[model samples]
Target chain A: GPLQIWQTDFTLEPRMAPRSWLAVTVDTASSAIVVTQHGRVTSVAAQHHWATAIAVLGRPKAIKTDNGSCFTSKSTREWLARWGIAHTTGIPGNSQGQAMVERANRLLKDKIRVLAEGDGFMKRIPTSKQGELLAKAMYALNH
Target chain B: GPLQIWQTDFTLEPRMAPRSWLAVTVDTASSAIVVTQHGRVTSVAAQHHWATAIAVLGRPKAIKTDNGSCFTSKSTREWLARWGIAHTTGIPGNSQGQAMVERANRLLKDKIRVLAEGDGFMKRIPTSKQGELLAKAMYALNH
Candidate 1:
């Protein structure tokens, strides 16, 4: 049951890139997460992250997301159907329903900020180095 | 001489996206600035921002950046050469040499933070809406 339900969201840092969208998915039962960064928050990008997550943690029975267009798009629903996974969306303006993934997002950002500070770049981290730093941050949390 | 020399840097928000890099260029003499967000911090991305800056405020005699490979790469140098702009770099680890642009980066981030707070999205800003927010933040600083 650990991987039976997944919830996802994108955390934004406007100070980063104009297109920066960090897609985060959490396994509700296990509190495990998969994080990926993308330039756009599109259905295709969401699908890509899901595929990567499924490869590492196996398929889930259902996935939860906000009412963002990307998650509610027909293409996204079709893609999830192909994988035999149900797609559920929280009511707009109702973040409490997505509390678990929202909490994970907060934890992930806090960890990243600490790591960046430790790296002596509290003011700004380098884009070229973000991927590695994100991986390090995620590893620190997951382990 | 106001627009003769420009210094540029990429401010990173690793929590935003794995590839988020906000390119900021500042005119040393005028203190005028141009900010753009990019998915990558590559030579091509740097060039694109330079072109955008040039169109708005005209070409600078020279540009300064950190010793990051993207700014030092052959393609970047070649592009600048074609535009008749000189390229200079700060001494490795010598932020003092790039104080003007560095200061601009900090100020821009501060403005963005305030704006996001006003928009009630201190936790996260949507990727789809960053461009407008970035423009507003830059305008607040530029004007």
Candidate 2:
């Protein structure tokens, strides 16, 4: 099968101090990220998120997501189902279905979110320190 | 007549992965780039490449270029003299003359070289594909 299977997922809760939720889809063929969305998290937020992901990641052959209310809800499944693509739900306990997205999100947070928190570098610091913090901050953001 | 001025220059041999070179110019007033050339990027070769572009670009309000030999060549200066366009030698120590270009380069490299370096995004593809890669990298590099 010339399958172009794609997986998608979103962050569930708001990150504290320095964290972000990341949702992304990976093309099985090239390992290229088709779509990625990162931001603060919420139950309802993840619902609208996958659409943004789909737009950039290209229309996937299939979509994968978590089993939270966002994915389990009738609207979530109904929306994906209406898109004419197979929608697989991660079993509540098993993240196997949305692993790529999960990994991308975790990496995004560790790489981007923590630094945005003003880690030691930004605490009541001078502007130059802030700039330095930001330089290294952004340096880590790209990591 | 509503006329605009652009300064032109090229970096010899500034790429990898079937590498080519970088030729670029800046608009004096708006300080924007009207054109850029990133080939199957390789090491700098021709010293006169920048001079050649300045001529082809026609006498700008003034032609602009770095102090490199290619730009500072006796022949290049004569070309500017004949055209009556000012040739401003960018401040050697000042990063300001080419700030916009410097920023642009940083940005494109992130999406291009960085992406390529990080994900095999650019490294894995054929050099023929470098154009799109360059475009994407540049387009995304701007603030």
What C-alpha lDDT do the candidate models reach, one value each?
A: 0.75, 0.47
Candidate 2 clash pair list:
A34-A57, B12-B44, B13-B43, B13-B44, B19-B40, B19-B41, B19-B42, B20-B40, B20-B41, B20-B42
Query: What tens digits encode model 2's per-residue C-alpha lDDT throughout B31-128?
Result: 44322354432222222333322322223565545677766777667755754666667754345566555544444444556746654553444554
For each candidate, report its DockQ versus the true two-chain complex: 0.02, 0.03
Fnat per candidate, as a fraction, reads: 0.00, 0.00
Lowest summed lDDT window (length 10), candidate 2 chain A:
A129-138
- lDDT by residue for model 1 over A1-80, one digit each (tens)? 43488888888753235446888888888888777778888888898778656643566899988888999899998989
Please name the candidate that would achieve the greatest lDDT relative to the true structure: 1
Task: Give lDDT tens digits, candidate 1, residues B22-81.
Answer: 888888888888877788888888876776566445668888888889888999989889
List, residue by residue over A91-128, the lDDT tens digit for candidate 2: 64355666665665565445434554545532333332
Angstrom error of the Cα, residue A45, model 2: value is 3.0
